[PDB]
Amino acid sequence: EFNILLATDSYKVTHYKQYPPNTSKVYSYFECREKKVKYEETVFYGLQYILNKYLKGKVVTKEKIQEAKDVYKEHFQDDVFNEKGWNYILEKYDGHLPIEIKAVPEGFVIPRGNVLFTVENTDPECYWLTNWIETILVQSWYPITVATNSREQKKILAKYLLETSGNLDGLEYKLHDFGYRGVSSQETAGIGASAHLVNFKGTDTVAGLALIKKYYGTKDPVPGYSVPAAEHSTITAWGKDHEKDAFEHIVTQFSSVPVSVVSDSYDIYNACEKIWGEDLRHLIVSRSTQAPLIIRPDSGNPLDTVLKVLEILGKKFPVTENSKGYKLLPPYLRVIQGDGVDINTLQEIVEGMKQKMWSIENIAFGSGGGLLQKLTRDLLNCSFKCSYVVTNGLGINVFKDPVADPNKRSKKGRLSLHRTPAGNFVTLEEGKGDLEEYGQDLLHTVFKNGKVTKSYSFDEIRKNAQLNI
Template sequence: MNAPIRPLARELNQLQPFNLADFYKTGHPSMYPAATTKLVANFTPRSAKYAPVLPELFDNKVVWFGLQGFIQQYLIDLFDQEFFRQPRDKAVRKYQRRMDTALGAGAVPASRLEALHALGHLPLEIRSLPEGARVDIKVPPVIFSNTHPDFPWVATYFETLFSCESWKPSTVATIAFEFRKLLDYFARLTGSAPEFVNWQGHDFSMRGMSGVHDAMRCGAGHLLSFTGTDTIPALDYLEDFYDADAERELVGGSIPASEHSVMALRILLTLQRLRRDPAHAGLEEGALRQLAEREVVREFVSQDYPQGMVSIVSDTFDFWNVVTVIARELKDDILARRPDALGNAKVVFRPDSGDPVKILTGYHDDELVRVDGLPARDADGAYTALSGGLRVTEAERKGAVECLWEIYGGTVSAAGYRLLDSHVGLIYGDSITLPRARAILRRLAAKGFASGNVVFGIGSFVYGMNSRDTFGYALKAIYAEVDGEAVDIYKDPATDDGTKKSAKGLLRVEREGDHYVLHQQQTAEQAEGGELRPVFRDGQLLSRQSLAEIRQRLMASWQCPEPGSIRWSVED
């Protein structure tokens, strides 16, 4: 048998540091005045006009996160491996080949890279606010400047790379913290345990993100505010770049959980076996399937996972049968489950389709057709929704939380809200947005249920549906020195609404109360002060920040409002 034909072996391109750019960046070093010796740039969140946040909680600040990981991965490790530790000709060859074949031979000279290679390090300084800080919109959390007069262009050359690697972890960390604010507020309002909020936002986003690297960095941003996650690589990232240690601290965690393929296979296999049993002769397919599903759930809670926590996706066929019939029939089995080492013995039911607000909280009376002021029921006992004319069963009118309460009961918090028995709970992870989470929590509170009855899976519909424009991140040059002459650089397009107006000259950022305040057109001496501290210089990371420090800084940056103090502008 002939061996497969393979293409001729050639050296892979890999990640060449200077190729990680837009083509137009490659020509800019030649376009700056030849006598330029100094260049300074800043990276700034310029606007929140497209941000998917709740106005009642958003205070015009973003969470700054991701710089340390970027510096270590790219400016240190990648530069060392693919540039400075390589022979000069090899280090430059891939870049020169790409420029010559795409832009034309000699269009971009190799001399600058050859000189940089001879220097032996990246002559760049980065100053930054601490990661985990919440930075006011229009205030730069980071600035770049060259440290050698022969290489001013390094301050702006990596704009594309830095932007594409940095805007999203910071954006996701910001949105995650907005969820944290919402959940903290309702926990305080309804008397749910504050520590439970750590688990109440759970990262479900990995499968919908733009690759593993995207998922791990954004998943790390989520873990600044929560500990619940299904994005395994995020924990690896935080251990690799943020001094986390899963053996000494809780970086992130999850619980055993089923998916539809598991449930459908086991239910349908059990159904086939039941159908062959003469004892079930005459039962219709639907009834057999319900028996099969009950048996599968029983196996899950009493045999497969007889202790601790387990999550069961419950809408493979009929969610309402699961939470009203099966949950009742298996009550003794569920209550008999043993606690794990942390004292948990909970079965979490997971709906995964339909309207999450209605599934969890049911319908208000004023959302149903009424007669004489009361919801009207037809001959089959169903109601009719005013919106769309949908038929609504009694279980759907109550919602999943109330259905489980009727079976299992629970406790009442100090604030007077009902909490389900600790053996049962609910998680919903299908298209949960901040407005939907707010609606669910408000409606539960209106029915007398505490926020701690539900966990939200936050997926790529929230974390992935963003862009650099979500917070308007941009890197712009702000200062230069040309032949000894200082130039304050800025842009202010007449055709813009002010969003793109950039900072001007050397900068200083000061902490004033709860805000970071930008001071522009500073002297060199003034620019040395303030809160922007050197974190990288000439190829060296100057300081390290741990996940624990960043989490602590972030949590201390916001004070939860008093219960009842928020007046929501939207009725849910």
């Protein structure tokens, strides 16, 4: 059972005693601060999950106040917990948070250094609450960063797909999520997988399917799809001497559907030349355009291994030249590179495939740790700061401006996001957005006093995150 009173940074428990006396409003905002992947624009995704899972409804109970008071007395070796403040929310509001959250629509692709969401207390007694929930809200850095980095990889794949083949067919099935085991927790898996599924349709991280269904919803049967595939265990269990029988049984069991057969168990080059290219060739050439064999190398240099595999297949199977002049394997034969794949190495493989005249139609990518784990809050400088305060009737525009780091400077006053006359975005500071020079604020109220006031379907998120191309 989750308790919002124990889901903050410990020092925030002490902050109610630190603000200027008679503070009635603490108003804060979140941005991906500005500074070969630059990440100049970000997909805004994941807040709806946090609003629903942690912030809406009766989140304050007498049992939760008692739990927090007893924990923090031991944790601080001092009584410094705001029992009165939390009891006030319980009595006046039936444990519903007197907070208002305004955000940019989910799936929206916004350039760096723009307000993405704002937080403020609706009750003067709860000026301290705005920054209590900073910690839980700042964790939206993760779904944002996964969705942005995955979108950046989609631009790479889309460039090389159109370059080498003239179409963008099956782009949505070119980057497969292999990350379930490589993430820090079961919860991160669902969050991360769901963020990737904003840009792609292929996933092995089953957790992401239920998260979308519960917090976003879709008109579609499933948010994501997978194909039957082998692991080293289902190959090696047959014995070193029976790597052929493993391959033979697997391709026969899944003959009406595409099947990924890991082929590096002992010798990848030997598996492609002797097993697939000769001994089981009659089981390959017969396969459907809707049911191809997907060969999977899983070791060695990703670009080197990819090229050696493809040419072996070029000798043993008929390779056709396409409209652009790029080599194309038969429709029943494809490849998956599911090892050492991140945004950088993905770029190096597709560039190499282009340089050796191979079409990107021939391959798909499998990314785990690089896709959902090897990402930090600093990649996009995801940050939550106080920009405005009301103390004893006087509103003041506040910000930090550290001398040794001007990139750490934050925005001032009440903020708003606007569509510019040239179809771009601008963040207005100091409440200038009230004048509506560039029309209405693009932030909408998504949360107000314990209630989710605006929700997005995963379908409109997907439409919003589409590549301009």
